[PDB]
């Protein structure tokens, strides 16, 4: 079905139409919503003060979780590394001496990141999560590239609402 | 919103239509 | 005929285009773009990774349309694997593409005005805008950039009231696209800025590939969606908003009437959206529910495969193009029966319409050529790839 | 005093000036669903004293451009502009220039120069191309500009300025010659450079011409006199066409009246501003050698018939 | 300050002279809009108005503008210094011929009617629609042929 | 004087603030058809200029020739416009 | 009295006027413009801020480099920052110009603009959310408030 | 109808405090508005909540001094607010 | 008369700037008030009339201007 | 809302009117409470000089029937 958006002298249709080229008409009508929304409420929120709003799904920062005991749950399968799309994640583990099995460097890259999300998905355990922290701007290069310490520290910081967000989007999931 | 019935009216009558029915501050 | 760089940077010039210009007078003699300013590498690095973790780069390919262009990848990859989406994914995709659409053209029609020099109605709709993003988010869990579309189905159900949101904005948007038009679509300087400017015969947009609203605006018949049916679009109706006429002015009408044809499918979307599944079943192609990984063996072992390996497409060679909010976005997907592709031209619609530029913008001033860049919506990531 | 009664003027009109910068800023946000500046300062009015000093504190980069042309248009720029506040007929007007009409018009004119100077000193292909833009759409303007005076001053019976306040004693001058006024008001358009007249800085179209190289305190000076004008030629209005009241006894209400329609029509081309895209170069051009200026030519016969055949010849004094 | 005028008549010579050296014709328009500036003033000093206004609106005016837009065109190619310099060494010469008259404003407005009700300049002028009006018959003439002989020069 | 003293005073205001932005920071066109345009301008100031002494020529006794007289300067100025566009030269 | 005071005090204002009004610049080229001009929209206005996206590299401060820098465009960018003013600041945003992004391996992408241009702020994020790009504007804000020029020059 | 916007106004310049309280919050913000406190947490901070605004303004959080000792009265960041009133804020989790 | 009407509805200037054209030229040719302008002009006493020799036989405004005879502007008047 | 534009406004109409009201009253001060005497033509220039020779040396002093 198809429709035509611009298909398209008696004294009055001219007298009218004089009328609109010499008062303009269609201008004034223009200038008359723009004052129309001067008298509107404007949307912008105080940034400090007032937040836009991200549901729990929202990637923002990545953070390494712990078992509620404190065992931090990454066990080293690797495989966040593997589905990485950026290379991003640089993971090398060996046996820790409980026998366990462990990370002995985990390295985001930040800046190689592209937040897919990807890696929340991947993970058994579930133990790399999308943190919903999306302020988390450097003055150096350096401070963004991040390894386990930073990430378990993440962690250990927003673990109460990244809890209340898998909460709400597991069934989903 | 907040229009107070007189600032509503030049919008209305400024736009030549009823912005209240379709407003821009989304409300619950 | 002097010579002069439109220049990367420059405020008009949708991102970065070197527009090398001719002008006699301020007659525009020449117009050869050059393009590459963005080039990134998007088809080569594609080779070098698997299925899943190639979809994220055509959300970037054209971002504006940052999902309509997923979903060209997926059909693609379904057709290569002869799946085809459970029967709700395929109308969120229809429900998720046509907001994009609507995203697209109110970039399209309000950057145009911006560059033109109406600044007002880049901000009355970006705030639309930002609503819908926040549709994005609530589902995906992005702004933009989501890689909500995969190539099984979508990747989540809608989250539990979405469908009730993308109602009450969908039941207003309408005055906001009227709004605009009181101050274009008749303004008495739009109309001369953009009627007769760039008019493209019909012959010749089939010729020079425009095959978008470039296309439409000229009066040709085209919309891949009402031609090709792809996912449901099959089961709406919707009215192509043919033009003639063709020029800048007619195009845009166009375009502000397919942002009103879409309010029209993403209504029906919300009245018949079936309950369901919205991934695949087949473990061998979508990814396992969490639940299933974590009690179930044969699900763990099909999540570890499907993320650390792949889907091991069959090995076979497919065209698929659907309309985008540009035109018509293609993805030819050779692939051996290994899990990572093999080569994955993107047709850009863009690539086409830069090309017209020369053919557009002849004898014509300095302004012309800032009104015509926007009335081909290029977007350089899809055109640069 | 009269030292006084420059400072008084000139400050006053300069504080107005920057003041001007947050209603447009201001404005133009409510009317594009935004606050508009308020963080710095109450309500953003610290906002145009900060920037100001941001612009004077930064390089004032010289290209590697004739120095001398170079600087002295900015100066050109702000002298004429205060300079043109000097005779306005406010109660009592600084200065009596028995021709006023007359100076406005010729330092109006001399402003030119700055921006046609500025291109060529600039020496960058954008800016070159700004000022041909420029020079061409100001003088033409200036033809349909001076014209329209000529029309008015013929049914004032002077060139003085103070004349009108005792010939709009009875009614505005939109009443008669609204034909003009809104040719005056488009024209004063054109003249400050504003949007639907703005193809001297586009910037979309082609970026900043005028002060493609300028930062720091060259931009400022134009700027501050491109802001300057806008009021002036809107004050103008409100004298020439919109006669505010004026009581001998009580000389105030006048000041006060002028201050009310200068504000609205200065808000007027705040409002235009938002509300339209540009006009084209050729379009511009257009509307005043095609458009307007056979209108502005066969009213002024009009207007020299009219005293004439209703024996109204205005009073020399 | 009687020098006033003779201050005045000096510095337009003074710009005279720097036109007289050729300059780039955008110096050359610049230099004559201060000589312009400064002849406006002079008529002013005399008392003329309407008079002083017209070079002002005339040459200050697009006189030299249509000139500076035409060099813009025709003239591309940018010794001005040396020219400065030999404009100081004339400056000097002016200076030092008036010095010889040294060794070797006292009568200005030479008469005026201190009342006076209809006197000024312009009225004179405005004669030329009354008693005068052979003058601007000729000079409407004078541009209503000037419009053909550019439009073919040109074509 | 009084304006040369506000004049003065002008300039050194400006003056004054181009040097403190200095001081303080320490720390080939083919424009045929404007051409056309241009030289009409100047007839056209030149026109305004006869124009302009018509606020006193409006007193004159021999109010009728005033009439006769800018009425035909309007109008033959007008034509030369005209021609331009019936000669189409301008566009 | 003492200088040293009344040089603090003097530096603040310094401070006060730059970090104020912070003119950016229009640098986009990887779709994250995008998400800047939804800053410079209604929900996020950064013109509240002092922020007016001036568009010409003489009269604007910092540069907000959002996007991916191909190697084509390398040098463009370093030009246009070497024509800005002095006092100019450079606000890295995406990680396709923090560092490479998903395009970091890739052979037409610059791994990084603090490769070619010196960068105060880096935003992170692939579209870096709009409100992390207001959080990093303001972050040099403080930065810049800081900075203590004149305090320096008195105590050299 | 306006006199009760004014009498509005009014209540709002008297809701912060005295004179000297609302020229705290109004050199801080920039916004002067009541609204009931939902709570105050550990590291100074005072949260407030109207239904009555819209959604994106509806929540708000007045940030105190010194939270970690900083001097915050000034350089207000979006960082101080704890994370477990984060997603309050942010409209993540409706329950304070 | 057919092209009159577009012309009204197109190029709509044109039309009202030579009506206007001529409307002037006609106004004046046909007024009760044109002839008053050469007065009203003619009257205003810019200049001093100088008196005369009251020679003899003089019909003139006599002596004193408030003497009736003389001309008179009650035409001004009561206008 | 819009209530906020009127701030800025505020100080640009006041210092709108000031140079009004201070033109006209720094008038009627210097010269004596009378307004400045508008000399377009010579007549009124030579009234006005005529003024100052009658008393002190300033023309708006004003002698009357009582000299
Ligand atoms: C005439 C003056 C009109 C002032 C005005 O804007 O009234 C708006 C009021 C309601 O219109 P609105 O702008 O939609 O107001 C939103 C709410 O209805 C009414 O607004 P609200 O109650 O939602 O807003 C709360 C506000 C309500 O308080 C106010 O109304 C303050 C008004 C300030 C300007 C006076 O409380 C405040 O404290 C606001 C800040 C006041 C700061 C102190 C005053 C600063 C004045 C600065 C300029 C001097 O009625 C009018 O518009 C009157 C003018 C009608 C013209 C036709
Ligand atoms: C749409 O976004 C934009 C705006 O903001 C809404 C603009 O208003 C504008 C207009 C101009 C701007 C870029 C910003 C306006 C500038 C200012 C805040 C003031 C400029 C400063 C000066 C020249 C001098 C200020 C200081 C004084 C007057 C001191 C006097 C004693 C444009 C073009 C724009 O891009
Ligand atoms: C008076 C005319 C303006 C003079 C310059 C401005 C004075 C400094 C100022 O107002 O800064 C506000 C600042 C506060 O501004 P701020 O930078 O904290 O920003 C306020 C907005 N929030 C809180 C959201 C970030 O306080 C000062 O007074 C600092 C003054 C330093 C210099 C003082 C004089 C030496
Ligand atoms: C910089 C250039 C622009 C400077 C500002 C604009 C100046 C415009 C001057 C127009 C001419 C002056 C004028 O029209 O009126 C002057 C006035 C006499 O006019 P009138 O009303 O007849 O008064 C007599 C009866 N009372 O009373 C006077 O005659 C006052 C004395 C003459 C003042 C003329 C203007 C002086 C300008 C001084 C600065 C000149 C700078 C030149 C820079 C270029 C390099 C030299
Ligand atoms: C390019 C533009 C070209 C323009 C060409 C114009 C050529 C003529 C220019 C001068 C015209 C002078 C006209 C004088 C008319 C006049 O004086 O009127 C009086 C008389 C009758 O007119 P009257 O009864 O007043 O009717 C008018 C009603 N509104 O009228 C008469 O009886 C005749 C009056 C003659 C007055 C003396 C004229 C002497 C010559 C003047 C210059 C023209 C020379 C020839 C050309
Ligand atoms: C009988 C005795 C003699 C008197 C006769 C009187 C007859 C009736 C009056 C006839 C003329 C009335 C109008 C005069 C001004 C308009 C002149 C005109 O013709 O407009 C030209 C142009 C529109 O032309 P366009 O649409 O391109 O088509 C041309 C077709 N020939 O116009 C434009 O495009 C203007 C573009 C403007 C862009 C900004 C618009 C701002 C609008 C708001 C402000 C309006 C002015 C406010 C003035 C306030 C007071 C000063
Ligand atoms: C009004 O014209 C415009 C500019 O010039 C001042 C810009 O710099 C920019 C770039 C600014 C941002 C915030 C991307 C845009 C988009 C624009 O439309
Ligand atoms: S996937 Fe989860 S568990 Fe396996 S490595 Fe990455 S993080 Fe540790
Ligand atoms: S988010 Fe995507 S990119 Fe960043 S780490 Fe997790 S997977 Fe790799
Ligand atoms: S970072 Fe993510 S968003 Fe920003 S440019 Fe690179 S890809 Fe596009």
Same mark, same amino acid.
């Given at each position: 079905?198809?429709?035509?958006?611009?298909?398209?002298?008696?004294?009055?249709?001219?007298?009218?139409?004089?009328?609109?080229?010499?008062?303009?008409?269609?201008?004034?009508?223009?200038?008359?919503?723009?004052?129309?929304?001067?008298?509107?409420?404007?949307?912008?929120?105080?940034?400090?003060?007032?937040?836009?709003?991200?549901?729990?799904?929202?990637?923002?920062?990545?953070?390494?979780?712990?078992?509620?005991?404190?065992?931090?749950?990454?066990?080293?399968?690797?495989?966040?590394?593997?589905?990485?799309?950026?290379?991003?994640?640089?993971?090398?583990?060996?046996?820790?001496?409980?026998?366990?099995?462990?990370?002995?460097?985990?390295?985001?890259?930040?800046?190689?990141?592209?937040?897919?999300?990807?890696?929340?998905?991947?993970?058994?355990?579930?133990?790399?999560?999308?943190?919903?922290?999306?302020?988390?701007?450097?003055?150096?290069?350096?401070?963004?590239?991040?390894?386990?310490?930073?990430?378990?520290?993440?962690?250990?910081?927003?673990?109460?609402?990244?809890?209340?967000? +898998?909460?709400?989007?597991?069934?989903?999931? | 919103?907040?229009?107070?019935?007189?600032?509503?009216?030049?919008?209305?009558?400024?736009?030549?239509?009823?912005?209240?029915?379709?407003?821009?501050?989304?409300?619950? | 005929?002097?010579?002069?760089?439109?220049?990367?940077?420059?405020?008009?010039?949708?991102?970065?285009?070197?527009?090398?210009?001719?002008?006699?007078?301020?007659?525009?003699?020449?117009?050869?773009?050059?393009?590459?300013?963005?080039?990134?590498?998007?088809?080569?690095?594609?080779?070098?990774?698997?299925?899943?973790?190639?979809?994220?780069?055509?959300?970037?390919?054209?971002?504006?349309?940052?999902?309509?262009?997923?979903?060209?990848?997926? +059909?693609?990859?379904?057709?290569?694997?002869?799946?085809?989406?459970?029967?709700?994914?395929?109308?969120?995709?229809?429900?998720?593409?046509?907001?994009?659409?609507?995203?697209?053209?109110?970039?399209?029609?309000?950057?145009?005005?911006?560059?033109?020099?109406?600044?007002?109605?880049?901000?009355?709709?970006?705030?639309?805008?930002?609503?819908?993003?926040?549709?994005?988010?609530?589902?995906?869990?992005?702004?933009?950039?989501?890689?909500?579309?995969?190539?099984?189905?979508?990747?989540?159900?809608?989250?539990?009231?979405?469908?009730?949101?993308?109602?009450?904005?969908?039941?207003?948007?309408?005055?906001?696209?009227?709004?605009?038009?009181?101050?274009?679509?008749?303004?008495?300087?739009?109309?001369?800025?953009?009627?007769?400017?760039?008019?493209?015969?019909?012959?010749?947009?089939?010729?020079?590939?425009?095959?978008?609203?470039?296309?439409?605006?000229?009066?040709?018949?085209?919309?891949?969606?009402?031609?090709?049916?792809?996912?449901?679009?099959?089961?709406?109706?919707?009215?192509?908003?043919?033009?003639?006429?063709?020029?800048?002015?007619?195009?845009?009408?166009?375009?502000?009437?397919?942002?009103?044809?879409?309010?029209?499918?993403?209504?029906?979307?919300?009245?018949?959206?079936?309950?369901?599944?919205?991934?695949?079943?087949?473990?061998?192609?979508?990814?396992?529910?969490?639940?299933?990984?974590?009690?179930?063996?044969?699900?763990?072992?099909?999540?570890?495969?499907?993320?650390?390996?792949?889907?091991?497409?069959?090995?076979?060679?497919?065209?698929?193009?659907?309309?985008?909010?540009?035109?018509?976005?293609?993805?030819?997907?050779?692939?051996?029966?290994?899990?990572?592709?093999?080569?994955?031209?993107?047709?850009?619609?863009?690539?086409?319409?830069?090309?017209?530029?020369?053919?557009?913008?002849?004898?014509?001033?300095?302004?012309?050529?800032?009104?015509?860049?926007?009335?081909?919506?290029?977007?350089?990531?899809?055109?640069?790839? | 005093?009269?030292?006084?009664?420059?400072?008084?003027?000139?400050?006053?009109?300069?504080?107005?000036?920057?003041?001007?910068?947050?209603?447009?800023?201001?404005?133009?946000?409510?009317?594009?669903?935004?606050?508009?500046?308020?963080?710095?300062?109450?309500?953003?009015?610290?906002?145009?004293?900060?920037?100001?000093?941001?612009?004077?504190?930064?390089?004032?980069?010289?290209?590697?451009?004739?120095?001398?042309?170079?600087?002295?248009?900015?100066?050109?720029?702000?002298?004429?502009?205060?300079?043109?506040?000097?005779?306005?007929?406010?109660?009592?007007?600084?200065?009596?220039?028995?021709?006023?009409?007359?100076?406005?018009?010729?330092?109006?004119?001399?402003?030119?120069?700055?921006?046609?100077?500025?291109?060529?000193?600039?020496?960058?292909?954008?800016?070159?191309?700004?000022?041909?833009?420029?020079?061409?759409?100001?003088?033409?303007?200036?033809?349909?500009?001076?014209?329209?005076?000529?029309?008015?001053?013929?049914?004032?019976?002077?060139?003085?300025?103070?004349?009108?306040?005792?010939?709009?004693?009875?009614?505005?001058?939109?009443?008669?010659?609204?034909?003009?006024?809104?040719?005056?008001?488009?024209?004063?358009?054109?003249?400050?450079?504003?949007?639907?007249?703005?193809?001297?800085?586009?910037?979309?179209?082609?970026?900043?011409?005028?002060?493609?190289?300028?930062?720091?305190?060259?931009?400022?000076?134009?700027?501050?006199?491109?802001?300057?004008?806008?009021?002036?030629?809107?004050?103008?209005?409100?004298?020439?066409?919109?006669?505010?009241?004026?009581?001998?006894?009580?000389?105030?209400?006048?000041?006060?009246?002028?201050?009310?329609?200068?504000?609205?029509?200065?808000?007027?081309?705040?409002?235009?501003?938002?509300?339209?895209?540009?006009?084209?170069?050729?379009?511009?051009?257009?509307?005043?050698?095609?458009?307007?200026?056979?209108?502005?030519?066969?009213?002024?016969?009009?207007?020299?018939?009219?005293?004439?055949?209703?024996?109204?010849?205005?009073?020399?004094? | 300050?009687?020098?006033?005028?003779?201050?005045?008549?000096?510095?337009?010579?003074?710009?005279?002279?720097?036109?007289?050296?050729?300059?780039?014709?955008?110096?050359?328009?610049?230099?004559?809009?201060?000589?312009?500036?400064?002849?406006?003033?002079?008529?002013?000093?005399?008392?003329?108005?309407?008079?002083?206004?017209?070079?002002?609106?005339?040459?200050?005016?697009?006189?030299?503008?249509?000139?500076?837009?035409?060099?813009?065109?025709?003239?591309?190619?940018?010794?001005?210094?040396? +020219?400065?310099?030999?404009?100081?060494?004339?400056?000097?010469?002016?200076?030092?011929?008036?010095?010889?008259?040294?060794?070797?404003?006292?009568?200005?407005?030479?008469?005026?009617?201190? $009342?006076? $009700?209809?006197?000024?300049?312009?009225?004179?002028?405005?004669?030329?629609?009354?008693?005068?009006?052979?003058?601007?018959?000729?000079?409407?003439?004078?541009?209503?042929?000037?419009?053909? +002989?550019?439009?073919?020069?040109?074509? | 004087?009084?304006?040369?003293?506000?004049?003065?005073?002008?300039?050194?205001?400006?003056?004054?603030?181009?040097?403190?932005?200095?001081?303080?920071?320490?720390?080939?066109?083919?424009?045929?058809?404007?051409?056309?345009?241009?030289?009409?301008?100047?007839?056209?100031?030149?026109?305004?200029?006869?124009?302009?002494?018509?606020?006193?020529?409006?007193?004159?006794?021999?109010?009728?020739?005033?009439?006769?007289?800018?009425?035909?300067?309007?109008?033959?100025?007008?034509?030369?416009?005209?021609?331009?566009?019936?000669?189409?030269?301008?566009? | 009295?003492?200088?040293?005071?009344?040089?603090?005090?003097?530096?603040?204002?310094?401070?006060?006027?730059?970090?104020?009004?912070?003119?950016?610049?229009?640098?986009?080229?990887?779709?994250?413009?995008?998400?800047?001009?939804?800053?410079?929209?209604?929900?996020?206005?950064?013109?509240?801020?002092?922020?007016?996206?001036?568009?010409?590299?003489?009269?604007?401060?910092?540069?907000?480099?959002?996007?991916?820098?191909?190697?084509?465009?390398?040098?463009?960018?370093?030009?246009?920052?070497?024509?800005?003013?002095?006092?100019?600041?450079?606000?890295?945003?995406?990680?396709?110009?923090?560092?490479?992004?998903?395009?970091?391996?890739?052979?037409?992408?610059?791994?990084?603009?603090?490769?070619?241009?010196?960068?105060?702020?880096?935003?992170?994020?692939?579209?870096?959310?709009?409100?992390?790009?207001?959080?990093?504007?303001?972050?040099?804000?403080?930065?810049?408030?800081?900075?203590?020029?004149?305090?320096?020059?008195?105590?050299? | 109808?306006?006199?009760?916007?004014?009498?509005?106004?009014?209540?709002?310049?008297?809701?912060?405090?005295?004179?000297?309280?609302?020229?705290?919050?109004?050199?801080?913000?920039?916004?002067?508005?009541?609204?009931?406190?939902?709570?105050?947490?550990?590291?100074?901070?005072?949260?407030?909540?109207?239904?009555?605004?819209?959604?994106?303004?509806?929540?708000?959080?007045?940030?105190?001094?010194?939270?970690?000792?900083?001097?915050?009265?000034?350089?207000?960041?979006?960082?101080?607010?704890?994370?477990?009133?984060?997603?309050?804020?942010?409209?993540?989790?409706?329950?304070? | 008369?057919?092209?009159?009407?577009?012309?009204?509805?197109?190029?709509?200037?044109?039309?009202?700037?030579?009506?206007?054209?001529?409307?002037?030229?006609?106004?004046?040719?046909?007024?009760?008030?044109?002839?008053?302008?050469?007065?009203?002009?003619?009257?205003?006493?810019?200049?001093?009339?100088?008196?005369?020799?009251?020679?003899?036989?003089?019909?003139?405004?006599?002596?004193?201007?408030?003497?009736?005879?003389?001309?008179?502007?009650?035409?001004?008047?009561?206008? | 809302?819009?209530?906020?534009?009127?701030?800025?406004?505020?100080?640009?109409?006041?210092?709108?009117?000031?140079?009004?009201?201070?033109?006209?009253?720094?008038?009627?001060?210097?010269?004596?409470?009378?307004?400045?005497?508008?000399?377009?033509?010579?007549?009124?220039?030579?009234?006005?000089?005529?003024?100052?020779?009658?008393?002190?040396?300033?023309?708006?002093?004003?002698?009357?029937?009582?000299?």
């Amino acid at each position: 079905t198809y429709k035509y958006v611009n298909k398209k002298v008696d004294m009055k249709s001219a007298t009218d139409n004089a009328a609109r080229i010499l008062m303009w008409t269609e201008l004034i009508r223009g200038l008359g919503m723009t004052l129309s929304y001067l008298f509107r409420e404007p949307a912008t929120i105080n940034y400090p003060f007032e937040k836009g709003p991200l549901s729990p799904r929202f990637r923002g920062e990545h953070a390494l979780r712990r078992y509620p005991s404190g065992e931090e749950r990454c066990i080293a399968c690797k495989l966040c590394e593997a589905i990485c799309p950026a290379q991003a994640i640089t993971i090398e583990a060996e046996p820790r001496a409980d026998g366990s099995r462990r990370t002995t460097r985990y390295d985001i890259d930040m800046t190689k990141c592209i937040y897919c999300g990807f890696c929340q998905e991947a993970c058994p355990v579930d133990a790399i999560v999308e943190g919903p922290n999306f302020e988390f701007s450097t003055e150096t290069h350096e401070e963004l590239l991040y390894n386990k310490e930073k990430l378990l520290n993440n962690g250990d910081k927003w673990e109460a609402e990244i809890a209340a967000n +898998i909460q709400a989007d597991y069934l989903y999931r | 919103a907040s229009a107070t019935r007189v600032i509503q009216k030049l919008r209305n009558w400024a736009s030549g239509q009823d912005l209240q029915a379709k407003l821009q501050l989304r409300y619950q | 005929n002097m010579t002069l760089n439109f220049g990367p940077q420059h405020p008009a010039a949708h991102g970065v285009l070197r527009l090398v210009l001719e002008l006699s007078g301020e007659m525009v003699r020449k117009c050869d773009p050059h393009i590459g300013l963005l080039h990134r590498g998007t088809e080569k690095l594609i080779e070098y990774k698997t299925y899943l973790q190639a979809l994220p780069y055509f959300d970037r390919l054209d971002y504006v349309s940052m999902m309509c262009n997923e979903q060209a990848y997926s +059909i693609a990859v379904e057709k290569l694997l002869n799946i085809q989406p459970p029967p709700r994914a395929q109308w969120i995709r229809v429900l998720f593409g046509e907001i994009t659409r609507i995203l697209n053209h109110i970039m399209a029609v309000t950057t145009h005005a911006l560059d033109i020099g109406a600044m007002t109605p880049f901000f009355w709709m970006f705030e639309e805008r930002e609503k819908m993003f926040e549709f994005y988010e609530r589902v995906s869990g992005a702004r933009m950039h989501a890689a909500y579309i995969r190539p099984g189905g979508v990747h989540q159900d809608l989250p539990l009231g979405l469908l009730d949101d993308i109602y009450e904005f969908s039941k207003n948007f309408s005055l906001r696209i009227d709004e605009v038009e009181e101050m274009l679509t008749n303004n008495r300087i739009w109309r001369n800025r953009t009627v007769d400017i760039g008019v493209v015969t019909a012959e010749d947009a089939l010729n020079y590939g425009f095959s978008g609203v470039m296309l439409r605006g000229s009066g040709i018949q085209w919309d891949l969606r009402k031609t090709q049916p792809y996912d449901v679009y099959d089961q709406v109706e919707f009215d192509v908003p043919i033009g003639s006429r063709g020029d800048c002015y007619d195009r845009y009408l166009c375009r502000v009437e397919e942002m009103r044809q879409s309010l029209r499918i993403i209504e029906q979307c919300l009245n018949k959206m079936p309950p369901g599944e919205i991934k695949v079943d087949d473990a061998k192609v979508s990814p396992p529910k969490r639940a299933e990984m974590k009690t179930s063996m044969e699900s763990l072992i099909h999540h570890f495969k499907l993320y650390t390996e792949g889907y091991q497409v069959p090995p076979g060679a497919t065209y698929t193009a659907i309309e985008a909010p540009k035109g018509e976005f293609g993805v030819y997907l050779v692939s051996d029966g290994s899990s990572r592709p093999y080569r994955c031209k993107i047709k850009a619609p863009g690539f086409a319409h830069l090309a017209g530029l020369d053919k557009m913008s002849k004898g014509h001033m300095l302004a012309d050529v800032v009104a015509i860049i926007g009335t081909q919506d290029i977007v350089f990531g899809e055109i640069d790839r | 005093m009269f030292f006084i009664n420059i400072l008084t003027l000139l400050v006053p009109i300069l504080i107005a000036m920057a003041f001007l910068t947050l209603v447009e800023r201001k404005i133009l946000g409510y009317m594009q669903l935004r606050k508009g500046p308020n963080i710095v300062g109450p309500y953003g009015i610290l906002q145009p004293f900060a920037d100001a000093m941001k612009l004077f504190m930064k390089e004032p980069m010289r290209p590697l451009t004739s120095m001398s042309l170079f600087i002295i248009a900015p100066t050109l720029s702000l002298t004429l502009a205060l300079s043109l506040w000097v005779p306005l007929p406010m109660p009592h007007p600084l200065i009596n220039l028995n021709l006023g009409i007359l100076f406005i018009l010729a330092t109006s004119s001399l402003s030119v120069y700055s921006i046609l100077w500025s291109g060529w000193a600039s020496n960058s292909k954008y800016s070159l191309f700004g000022a041909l833009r420029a020079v061409a759409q100001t003088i033409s303007y200036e033809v349909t500009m001076a014209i329209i005076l000529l029309s008015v001053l013929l049914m004032n019976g002077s060139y003085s300025l103070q004349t009108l306040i005792t010939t709009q004693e009875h009614m505005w001058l939109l009443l008669p010659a609204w034909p003009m006024a809104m040719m005056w008001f488009i024209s004063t358009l054109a003249e400050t450079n504003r949007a639907p007249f703005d193809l001297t800085e586009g910037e979309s179209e082609l970026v900043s011409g005028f002060n493609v190289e300028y930062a720091a305190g060259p931009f400022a000076l134009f700027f501050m006199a491109e802001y300057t004008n806008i009021i002036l030629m809107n004050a103008l209005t409100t004298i020439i066409f919109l006669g505010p009241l004026y009581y001998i006894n009580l000389p105030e209400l006048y000041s006060t009246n002028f201050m009310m329609e200068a504000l609205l029509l200065s808000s007027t081309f705040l409002w235009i501003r938002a509300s339209y895209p540009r006009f084209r170069y050729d379009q511009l051009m257009h509307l005043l050698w095609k458009n307007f200026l056979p209108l502005t030519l066969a009213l002024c016969m009009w207007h020299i018939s009219l005293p004439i055949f209703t024996a109204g010849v205005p009073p020399y004094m | 300050m009687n020098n006033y005028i003779f201050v005045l008549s000096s510095l337009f010579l003074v710009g005279c002279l720097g036109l007289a050296l050729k300059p780039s014709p955008i110096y050359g328009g610049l230099g004559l809009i201060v000589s312009g500036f400064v002849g406006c003033l002079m008529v002013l000093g005399f008392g003329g108005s309407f008079l002083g206004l017209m070079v002002f609106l005339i040459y200050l005016g697009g006189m030299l503008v249509v000139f500076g837009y035409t060099t813009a065109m025709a003239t591309e190619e940018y010794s001005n210094w040396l +020219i400065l310099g030999f404009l100081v060494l004339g400056v000097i010469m002016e200076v030092f011929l008036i010095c010889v008259l040294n060794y070797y404003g006292d009568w200005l407005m030479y008469e005026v009617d201190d $009342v006076g $009700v209809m006197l000024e300049g312009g009225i004179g002028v405005a004669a030329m629609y009354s008693c005068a009006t052979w003058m601007m018959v000729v000079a409407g003439w004078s541009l209503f042929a000037g419009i053909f +002989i550019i439009i073919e020069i040109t074509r | 004087m009084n304006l040369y003293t506000v004049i003065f005073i002008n300039i050194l205001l400006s003056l004054t603030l181009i040097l403190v932005a200095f001081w303080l920071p320490q720390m080939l066109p083919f424009s045929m058809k404007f051409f056309l345009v241009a030289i009409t301008f100047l007839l056209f100031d030149l026109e305004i200029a006869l124009l302009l002494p018509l606020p006193w020529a409006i007193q004159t006794i021999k109010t009728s020739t005033m009439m006769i007289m800018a009425f035909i300067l309007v109008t033959i100025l007008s034509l030369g416009l005209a021609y331009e566009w019936t000669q189409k030269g301008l566009e | 009295s003492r200088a040293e005071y009344v040089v603090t005090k003097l530096d603040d204002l310094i401070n006060w006027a730059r970090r104020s009004s912070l003119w950016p610049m229009t640098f986009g080229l990887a779709c994250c413009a995008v998400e800047m001009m939804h800053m410079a929209a209604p929900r996020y206005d950064m013109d509240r801020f002092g922020v007016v996206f001036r568009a010409s590299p003489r009269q604007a401060d910092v540069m907000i480099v959002a996007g991916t820098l191909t190697n084509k465009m390398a040098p463009a960018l370093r030009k246009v920052y070497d024509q800005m003013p002095e006092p100019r600041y450079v606000v890295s945003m995406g990680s396709c110009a923090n560092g490479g992004g998903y395009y970091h391996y890739s052979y037409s992408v610059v791994r990084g603009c603090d490769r070619i241009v010196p960068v105060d702020i880096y935003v992170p994020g692939c579209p870096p959310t709009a409100e992390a790009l207001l959080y990093g504007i303001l972050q040099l804000q403080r930065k810049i408030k800081r900075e203590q020029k004149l305090k320096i020059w008195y105590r050299r | 109808e306006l006199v009760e916007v004014l009498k509005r106004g009014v209540q709002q310049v008297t809701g912060h405090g005295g004179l000297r309280g609302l020229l705290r919050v109004f050199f801080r913000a920039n916004d002067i508005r009541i609204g009931t406190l939902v709570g105050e947490d550990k590291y100074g901070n005072k949260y407030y909540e109207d239904n009555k605004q819209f959604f994106g303004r509806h929540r708000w959080v007045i940030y105190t001094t010194e939270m970690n000792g900083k001097n915050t009265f000034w350089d207000v960041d979006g960082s101080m607010v704890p994370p477990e009133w984060h997603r309050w804020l942010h409209c993540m989790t409706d329950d304070p | 008369s057919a092209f009159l009407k577009n012309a009204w509805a197109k190029e709509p200037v044109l039309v009202v700037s030579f009506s206007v054209w001529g409307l002037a030229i006609i106004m004046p040719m046909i007024s009760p008030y044109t002839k008053y302008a050469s007065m009203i002009n003619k009257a205003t006493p810019y200049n001093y009339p100088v008196p005369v020799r009251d020679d003899g036989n003089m019909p003139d405004v006599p002596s004193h201007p408030q003497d009736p005879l003389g001309p008179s502007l009650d035409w001004l008047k009561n206008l | 809302m819009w209530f906020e534009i009127l701030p800025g406004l505020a100080i640009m109409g006041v210092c709108l009117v000031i140079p009004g009201v201070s033109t006209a009253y720094i008038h009627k001060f210097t010269n004596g409470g009378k307004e400045k005497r508008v000399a377009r033509v010579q007549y009124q220039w030579y009234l006005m000089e005529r003024d100052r020779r009658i008393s002190g040396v300033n023309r708006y002093y004003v002698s009357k029937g009582l000299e």
